[PDB]
Amino acid sequence: AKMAFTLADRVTEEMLADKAALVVEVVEENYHDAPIVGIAVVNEHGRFFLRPETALADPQFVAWLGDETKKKSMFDSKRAAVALKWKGIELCGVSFDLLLAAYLLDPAQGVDDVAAAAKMKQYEAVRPDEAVYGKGAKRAVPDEPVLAEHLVRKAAAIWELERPFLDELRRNEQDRLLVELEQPLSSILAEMEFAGVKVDTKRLEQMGKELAEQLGTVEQRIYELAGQEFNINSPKQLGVILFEKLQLPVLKKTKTGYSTSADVLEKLAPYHEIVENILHYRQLGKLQSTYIEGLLKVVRPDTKKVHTIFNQALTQTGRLSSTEPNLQNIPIRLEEGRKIRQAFVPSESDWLIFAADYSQIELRVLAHIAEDDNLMEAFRRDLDIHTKTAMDIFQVSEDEVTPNMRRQAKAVNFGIVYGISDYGLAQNLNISRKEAAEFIERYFESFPGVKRYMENIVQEAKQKGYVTTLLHRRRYLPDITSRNFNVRSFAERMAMNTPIQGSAADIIKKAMIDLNARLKEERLQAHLLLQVHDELILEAPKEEMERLCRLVPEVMEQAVTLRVPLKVDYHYGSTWYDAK
DNA sequence: GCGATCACGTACGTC
DNA sequence: GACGTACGTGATCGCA
Ligand SMILES: OC[C@H]1O[C@@](CO)(O[C@H]2O[C@H](CO)[C@@H](O)[C@H](O)[C@H]2O)[C@@H](O)[C@@H]1O
Ligand SMILES: OC[C@H]1O[C@@](CO)(O[C@H]2O[C@H](CO)[C@@H](O)[C@H](O)[C@H]2O)[C@@H](O)[C@@H]1O
Ligand SMILES: [Mg+2]
Numbered sequence: 074a075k076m077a078f079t080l081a082d083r084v085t086e087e088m089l090a091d092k093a094a095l096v097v098e099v100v101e102e103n104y105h106d107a108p109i110v111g112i113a114v115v116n117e118h119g120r121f122f123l124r125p126e127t128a129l130a131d132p133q134f135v136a137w138l139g140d141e142t143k144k145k146s147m148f149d150s151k152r153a154a155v156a157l158k159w160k161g162i163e164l165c166g167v168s169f170d171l172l173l174a175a176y177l178l179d180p181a182q183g184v185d186d187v188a189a190a191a192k193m194k195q196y197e198a199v200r201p202d203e204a205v206y207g208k209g210a211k212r213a214v215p216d217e218p219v220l221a222e223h224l225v226r227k228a229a230a231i232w233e234l235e236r237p238f239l240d241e242l243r244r245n246e247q248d249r250l251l252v253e254l255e256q257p258l259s260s261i262l263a264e265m266e267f268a269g270v271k272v273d274t275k276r277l278e279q280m281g282k283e284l285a286e287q288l289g290t291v292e293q294r295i296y297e298l299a300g301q302e303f304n305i306n307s308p309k310q311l312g313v314i315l316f317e318k319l320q321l322p323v324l325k326k327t328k329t330g331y332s333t334s335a336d337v338l339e340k341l342a343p344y345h346e347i348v349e350n351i352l353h354y355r356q357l358g359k360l361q362s363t364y365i366e367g368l369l370k371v372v373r374p375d376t377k378k379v380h381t382i383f384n385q386a387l388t389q390t391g392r393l394s395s396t397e398p399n400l401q402n403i404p405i406r407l408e409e410g411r412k413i414r415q416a417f418v419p420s421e422s423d424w425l426i427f428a429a430d431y432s433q434i435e436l437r438v439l440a441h442i443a444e445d446d447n448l449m450e451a452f453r454r455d456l457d458i459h460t461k462t463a464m465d466i467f468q469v470s471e472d473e474v475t476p477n478m479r480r481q482a483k484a485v486n487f488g489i490v491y492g493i494s495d496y497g498l499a500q501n502l503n504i505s506r507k508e509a510a511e512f513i514e515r516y517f518e519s520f521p522g523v524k525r526y527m528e529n530i531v532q533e534a535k536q537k538g539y540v541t542t543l544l545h546r547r548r549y550l551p552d553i554t555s556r557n558f559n560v561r562s563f564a565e566r567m568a569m570n571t572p573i574q575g576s577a578a579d580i581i582k583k584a585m586i587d588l589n590a591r592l593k594e595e596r597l598q599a600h601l602l603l604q605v606h607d608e609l610i611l612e613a614p615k616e617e618m619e620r621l622c623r624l625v626p627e628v629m630e631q632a633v634t635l636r637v638p639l640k641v642d643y644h645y646g647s648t649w650y651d652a653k
Numbered sequence: 654g655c656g657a658t659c660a661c662g663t664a665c666g667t668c
Numbered sequence: 669g670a671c672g673t674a675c676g677t678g679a680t681c682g683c684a
Contacts, residue, residue: 211658308664327662333663335665359665363672384671397672398672399666402672406666410666435668435669487669491670492669571670607668656682659678660680662676665674
């Protein structure tokens with residue numbers, strides 16, 4: 074049972090219709106400067122397979138690819154677009170992306186290939202990529218006959234599934250979400266990934282040296298205090314030294330044995346001097362392994378740039394994720410690790426890094442969605458929200474709020490957003506369950522609208538089977554009806570949190586689209602480099618800083634209109650570290 | 654039997 | 669609440 078198709082040796086005009094399912098196959102997981110192993114086209118005139126070397130060298134085919142009036146339906150068009158950018162070829166006219174369509178229909182399905190998306194509509198006339206290419210290590214491109222049929226079958230599925238997927242998106246009121254938000258964003262992410270972020274490798278290498286020295290020192294000190302050498306990196310070996318040789322108290326256990334998380338070590342520090350050293354060692358080693366060595370491993374030696382890949386179809390809440398390298402988790406909390414940001418620099422001379430971030434976007438979204446009078450007023454006054462929460466739940470004036478009170482109020486705020494339970498809050502604040510329960514109780518008394526929302530949203534998830542965000546993104550919560558307390562509760566926390574985190578995701582994605590349109594209208598050279606959930610990082614000529622200081626915050630603040638204002642802070646400097 | 658690879662638990666970096 | 673990467677350790681793979 075083979076699918077019919079023409080294995081063309083040359084490109085013909087009927088392969089260039091103004092509507093087609095297109096496959097530009099890039100097998101390598103990381104598609105940056107990666108090989109395109111084959112091309113497949115399916116349109117009204119039939120199915121075709123084209124060898125990349127000839128198709129991509131064909132002026133007509135290249136022109137067709139770049140013609141915005143020639144509409145293409147694809148799966149993961151960003152992958153193709155970026156792989157083509159590295160070859161100096163522009164991809165335009167992508168009007169439908171099955172990966173993004175499937176993602177929006179149900180993020181939980183984990184659709185990562187055409188076959189997985191096709192199975193949603195009982196279409197199985199296509200094989201999963203893994204079945205054709207093999208897993209991880211044994212992952213190889215098969216001979217042409219096998220490759221060609223696979224690409225043609227994927228194109229054929231895309232061709233057949235577009236209407237069905239679009240129809241369901243329409244029924245879900247998500248058609249604009251795909252067409253006006255995710256698809257345009259995909260092209261923007263492609264530009265961002267392709268541009269990359271320049272790295273000062275000399276800076277990183279120098280940091281590595283000083284880290285190595287500091288590690289050697291702490292390393293020896295640890296052995297001295299332990300009275301013997303061992304693999305500090307090993308949980309088993311460490312636990313034995315700490316809880317057996319040194320007799321430290323076992324305050325927490327792990328499914329496998331002794332727990333040695335920083336949370337536990339801090340509590341053990343007063344008992345023995347080795348503890349602080351282990352914590353320090355943990356901090357330095359994390360920086361050395363994950364950020365210094367890890368980063369230098371992925372930097373391109375010729376341009377000294379790192380090109381992350383933003384997974385736009387993975388998170389259950391609509392957020393993006395970042396990989397190889399993950400540029401969404403570069404240190405900042407602690408000064409030592411924060412200095413790593415000094416290594417992220419502008420890509421051109423006399424340019425600067427510009428960073429803009431939303432101020433408390435999640436709590437502002439919560440105020441809007443819950444329509445809580447107290448919380449909305451708080452933001453209308455642009456109050457320090459943690460101080461305000463402390464005043465309310467602890468019943469004191471502003472000048473009566475102590476640093477510890479603000480710290481705990483802040484913990485409660487993070488918890489309320491996470492739909493946190495009394496135990497979750499108790500664990501984070503390191504207090505009792507009942508105590509944590511009282512804080513939550515006081516919070517709801519001060520913010521009745523929020524309590525009402527949390528109650529109503531859980532019931533809505535139960536009734537509808539899912540919850541939605543401002544721009545109609547959805548997340549199914551089948552566990553919401555489980556008779557298992559733990560499972561159901563987790564589903565409830567997700568019901569309370571997804572509309573918040575998800576709506577914040579919708580807003581910044583929209584801001585990105587609005588921003589790029591504005592930058593183009595103004596013909597600024599400034600361009601986006603990264604997005605870190607609630608912040609946008611750009612780079613631009615130093616001469617554009619003044620215009621960006623007004624333009625970026627405004628665009629981000631006006632992306633959507635809520636019942637409370639949106640507020641954006643911004644900074645700029647010679648490096649990402651300096652953009653503070 | 655021996656690298657190479659895979660599977661999974663633990664810890665920790667971000668918002 | 670949402671992520672990704674590095675590590676250690678035990679198990680399984682691919683071949684003789
Ligand atoms: O191209 C990104 C896009 O591809 C998927 C598979 O459909 O993920 C692949 O590529 C990522 C980037 O290298 C890898 O992290 C991932 O392991 C690989 O399967 C989608 O999830 C993603 O949206
Ligand atoms: O007072 C009930 C209160 O409990 C929550 C969980 O904190 O939900 C429970 O009770 C509901 C009945 O009203 C069930 O639908 C739900 O499954 C059960 O967990 C709150 O949502 C509710 O306000
Ligand atoms: Mg912020």
